Amino acid sequence: GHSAPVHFFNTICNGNGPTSFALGATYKTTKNEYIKVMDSVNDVGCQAYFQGLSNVQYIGGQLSGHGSPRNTSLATITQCNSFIIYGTDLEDINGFTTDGTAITADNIDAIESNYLKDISGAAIVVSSCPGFKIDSPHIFKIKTLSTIKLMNNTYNYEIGGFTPDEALKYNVWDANGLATNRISGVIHPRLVNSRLGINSVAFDNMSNKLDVSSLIHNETSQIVGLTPSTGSNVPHTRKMWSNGAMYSSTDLNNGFRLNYLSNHNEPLTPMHLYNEFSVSEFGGSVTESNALDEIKYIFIQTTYANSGDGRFIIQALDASGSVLSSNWYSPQSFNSTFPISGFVRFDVPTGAKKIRYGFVNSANYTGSLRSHFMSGFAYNKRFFLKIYAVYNDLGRYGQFEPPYSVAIDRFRVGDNTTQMPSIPASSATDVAGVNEVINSLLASLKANGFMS
Amino acid sequence: GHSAPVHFFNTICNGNGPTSFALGATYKTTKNEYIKVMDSVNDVGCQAYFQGLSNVQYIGGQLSGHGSPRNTSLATITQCNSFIIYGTDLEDINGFTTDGTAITADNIDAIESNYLKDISGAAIVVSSCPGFKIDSPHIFKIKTLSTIKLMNNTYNYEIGGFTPDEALKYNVWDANGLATNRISGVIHPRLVNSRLGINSVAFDNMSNKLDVSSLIHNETSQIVGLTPSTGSNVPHTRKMWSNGAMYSSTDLNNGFRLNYLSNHNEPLTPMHLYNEFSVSEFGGSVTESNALDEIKYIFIQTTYANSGDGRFIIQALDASGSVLSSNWYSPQSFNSTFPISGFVRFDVPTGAKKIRYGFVNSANYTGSLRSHFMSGFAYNKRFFLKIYAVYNDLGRYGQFEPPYSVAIDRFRVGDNTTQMPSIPASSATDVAGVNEVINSLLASLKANGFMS
């Protein structure tokens, strides 16, 4: 049941929440009776609460908590339709949870894990409101986890360019999770490459993600597998990696070889499957305060599997090869989409010169990509790996993309080379000795893909 | 200090700045005393001036100069926060500068070069206002250099689809320049492919630039250099170019070979490094009024350098091969992001059939890319070249992108060919003569990159 349409013009809600004084206060009536103002010691409030509405326009008002009242949010929108905000002043929130837990930068990590499905933790919490829009307000003094929280099937939201870095952890906190739900929202690019960015779920549902990032690694499985294989669910050639090897040569359907690594801050050896590339390369006549960093965030998308022991490692190195930062990622960590695949976020620290990424084994044995990362193809039969690089500035150092030229036929249409038909061995009865180099050259051609 | 939030509704500011009559006017007081109205002969004004505000909404008003008053702009926003415009009528501006210089179509080039940092030259001038929104209003009769001007760290702006071609030079004039600033704005795509487009700085900061354009040339330096190299800071091969050569076959790190050319309208020879491709290919049963042009603008991004005689040349040719238009681009011209790289804009004239682009030398000697275009790798240690083609219509002729097919393994995962191990020379003592054709094929395989 609902009412539509509700119109709000230049309306201000200020200071509306349980405060320190109100919780301990007792109202004395004219009949000399005392009434306890609080319902409980964990009483929490809000400035504006909306539920069961449609076509609500809040045009140029103000939502702020002055006097530090215990608020779970400034505006709570639940089960509404087409809630649009037009330049509302938002400021001075006192972050709390629904059960009365104070949101503080000290315990900001336990709030995201234990209170993900809670209706709290942002200046504006949107729950089950399809047509949401915020339209670039000015926000400041936000003492909670994020600025906007989206959850419970908010699938067509649009978020404008408000003040990026005001909350404690994020700017946009997408908490939508359900396999049946298809979320596709629009986020301003300036909110992604800021000091506080968006979480991995918000980047999963960001439709204009190529406006701020680009793919630095794109690998998928082939259609027809090679000769020594019993399937075509993983790569069989290793041609996309600089170090490492394959798990098996008699069954290529087993993926890459996962070698043991004790922790993510340990050095990678040539036996591990990993790549390496440099960033932020500027000359000697440039000051490091003028030349900023290249990459701000790195988003990795991979297949999802319930069990693990196979880790996707990523490291940020500097000059002299010292590890500045690292992180593990188990197969069950990619659950933006629980059934198929998910996203993870990695923060590139300032001063990093090189980036390493690959697959390792967290247990003390040698595993394979199929059995120890994909769980034997139980949740997905097509492996893929996508790594997005969110640049600090749009195109300062040049975005990384595959080479192409409209005037060169090798890149415009591709090269005109085909696999040669199989040539039999040289067994002429006219001379020996030369059959040494001929059959070896014919064998090298067949072994390197040039010949069938 | 500031006031927030200021609300404007259906408010009109009409014909306010100093006029011809007012400048020469003298007020006669009741006490028979005379007061000169004009402070100086170069008095200038605007309809609305805003400074030090936050969360300002101008909802459906009108800003117009009637009676031709001397105005630097219609609205001047300076050091504000979240200024949003909602469908405001804007019209009839008389372009002037802050010092009283009239902005006409004759001096439109000297004003852009000499008054870049001036707070003037547009219908709406935005200076140091992060959250600016324009919401696409209807605009006409604009006698300034541009319609919107952005400068002084306006880093997150959205510009809607207003009337494109009303100003004299541009639609959006981005004047943001600073090494520490990170600008990321959103511009409506219909404002980029218009008669008047956006300047090179606005395309630099345009995050949704792939919605209106596509890369027709993308080239970067490799990681590991070739054998005679002394470093890997430039392309060591010439596979991206159809003409020209390398500077020296003994170093390969000096880059391409820059040959002398008198002017940009001179014909390019096979000794020059340049490419060529055709545009607007329609059949005989199509009328040229129905078949429009293919490319509207071309944006080139390259590394910055403070000196050098090497020039990036681009030419627009026709049938019979006559040069319609051309332009030089020195290394200092790529300074839209001063310390690293920059953008330039080239206007493709109507009737053009072919486009040529490459690198030449403006001085009468043969130079190299490392020394005569870059300053010895003093600013950027990685060379890149990205050329964007802004199409007249979105996909009329088909956008140029690398070939791909999801059903072909050669394009889905790549070809399964590797460099063969080095095969020694055939020196068998059993027969000669054939060893000539054997070692010549083995030498060619090693020379063509097929063999190590």
Residue numbers in the entry:
A (entry chain A), B (entry chain B): 455 to 906
Paper passage:
To bypass this protective barrier, some phages encode polysaccharide-degrading enzymes referred to as depolymerases to provide access to cell surface receptors. Here, we characterized the structure and enzymatic activity of DpK2, showing it to be a capsule-degrading hydrolase specific for K2-type polysaccharides. Based largely on homology modeling, but supported by recent structural analyses, depolymerase RBPs are modular, comprising three functional domains: an N-terminal domain that tethers it to the phage baseplate or to other elements of the tail, a central β-helical domain that contains the enzymatic activity of the protein, and a C-terminal domain which may either act as an autochaperone or, in some cases, form a noncatalytic carbohydrate binding module. While the archetypal siphoviruses such as Lambda, T1, T5, and Chi use “L-shaped” or fibrous appendages on their tails to bind cell surface features, phage RAD2 has globular appendages comprised of the depolymerase RBP DpK2.
To investigate the mechanism by which the RBP capsule depolymerase functions, DpK2 was purified as an enzymatically active trimer and its structure solved at a resolution of 2.7 Å. Initial reconstructions using C1 symmetry revealed an elongated molecule of approximately 180 Å (18 nm) in length, consistent with the dimensions of the tail appendages measured in the initial TEM micrographs of the RAD2 virion. Three discernible domains of DpK2 could be observed: an N-terminal domain containing an extended triple helical bundle, a central beta-helical domain, and a distinct C-terminal domain. C3 symmetry was used to further refine the structure of DpK2 to 2.7 Å resolution. Residues 191 to 906 of DpK2 could be modeled within the electron density. However, due to the applied C3 symmetry, high-resolution structural information of the N-terminal triple helical bundle was lost. The central domain (residues 317 to 642) is formed by three parallel right-handed β-helices consisting of 10 rungs, with each helix of the trimer being formed by an individual monomer. Analysis of the surface properties of DpK2 revealed a prominent negatively charged cavity (yellow oval) located within the central β-helical domain at the interface between neighboring monomers. Adjacent grooves (yellow lines) were observed emanating from the cavity, which may facilitate binding to or funneling of substrates toward the active site. This cavity consists of a negatively charged triad (D543, E545, and D546) and two dyads (D399-E423 and D619-E620) within close proximity, suggesting that DpK2 may function as a hydrolase. However, structural differences were observed in the C-terminal domain of DpK2, which consists of a β-sandwich fold followed by a far C-terminal α-helical bundle.
